[PDB]
């Protein structure tokens with residue numbers, strides 16, 4: 224178990240840690256989150272009570288170091304910092320009184336949700352999408368645009384997702400215009416899987432990360448990327464069987480976790496009706512189709 | 524963006540633009556089989572690609588052999604149109620390539636954009652103008668060359684004949700769409716209007732009769748009357 228201590232909580236805030244969230248009042252005696260599994264990946268996110276604009280947060284992996292949160296009264300946000308002096312950190316986190324003012328990561332044992340949602344997500348790939356090499360953790364917020372969006376305005380503060388554009392030369396072989404636009408298998412298998420991602424696990428990792436940034440931060444470009452990566456698979460007549468089966472499970476848990484009141488803003492009616500009811504893979508998403516129909520029949 | 528009538532004059536600025544109409548690419552007759560079924564038979568068609576400023580019409584004849592052994596022909600026809608328009612653009616010297624291609628049917632947008640990826644600076648757009656280019660096959664010389672073709676063929680016409688010697692491109696395009704709307708609305712009566720007088724002939728190198736300026740005013744009036752008469756008949760006005 225690891226601990227993400229907080230120096231203080233000077234401003235009232237809603238704090239998320241992975242799929243959980245709780246509130247902290249202004250200047251409440253709150254010193255952090257205790258009992259976190261080392262895991263492979265985590266996210267801590269914030270939405271200020273007095274200004275719900277800018278949700279923001281940090282992706283991190285406890286294995287890569289000791290992370291703590293300190294509020295910065297100049298920039299006005301809770302900042303993640305790393306302590307390299309592990310003994311000093313162990314001394315602060317040992318502290319029995321400090322632990323009394325910390326909330327415990329509250330994982331039900333039957334609950335494997337967090338890991339179903341992040342199975343393919345790895346910190347080293349996050350750090351390639353979110354470029355800030357001097358930190359081991361990665362900052363994302365509601366307003367950050369994607370590199371692709373920027374091409375249609377600060378490349379430092381951007382989300383470097385893999386560009387997917389169905390009406391581009393990368394997606395369309397000269398001489399195969401109709402073929403490749405109607406059946407995106409070339410673009411999926413040769414360009415993306417063999418060329419860029421190298422395997423389906425890395426593809427799914429970016430798809431999972433995009434989903435989670437859209438859900439936790441309301442990041443619009445992330446939502447666009449999640450939907451595009453889904454549509455690329457579904458619009459391909461030729462897809463490995465293992466990948467289709469795994470896609471059904473990935474999407475099932477994403478749809479299951481989605482806030483029910485957030486379906487108008489996080490689900491694109493067009494894409495999902497194409498994928499479930501019209502595409503080459505309509506029949507390969509049995510569990511996803513079943514949860515969507517019973518949970519969100521209005522969208523369909 | 525989508526074109527219309529606030530910017531109707533813009534069609535005649537100096538940016539080269541082409542209209543593309545695909546409504547006569549895939550054409551069929553519908554007839555009953557021996558077993559009693561009904562069967563289609565394709566007949567030759569054409570892509571109608573027009574420069575509205577100059578009158579230059581690039582008529583690509585679509586021979587029925589291109590459909591042989593193909594499925595989903597309505598869908599294929601859009602991609603075939605897009606293939607041929609892209610080929611036309613590539614065949615043109617750079618200074619003659621359009622800055623905009625305006626498709627009369629929105630279903631042409633994605634096929635054409637995908638075939639024109641090599642030309643990112645060429646805008647591909649629909650229009651809110653309802654244009655009567657589907658009546659192009661009512662122009663006898665165009666219909667003749669399409670129906671006589673035994674192989675794919677491209678034929679160049681000036682759909683304004685020599686009118687630009689005397690009127691503006693704006694006026695010529697208005698005359699053309701009036702004529703074509705009348706042909707679409709009541710083809711046999713529109714042809715009677717145009718051909719009723721044997722002393723006004725069609726030059727060997729023209730599509731329309733050699734009307735004088737005053738005769739064109741009269742013809743245009745008779746075409747407007749034809750269109751209004753048919754409106755009244757249709758809606759019992």
Ligand SMILES: CC(C)OCc1ccc(C(=O)O)cc1
Nearest residue numbers: 228229230254306312315321
């Ligand atoms: C519980 C206590 C207030 O945590 C604050 C905090 C701040 C810094 C560090 C460090 O740098 O070692 C560790 C913990």
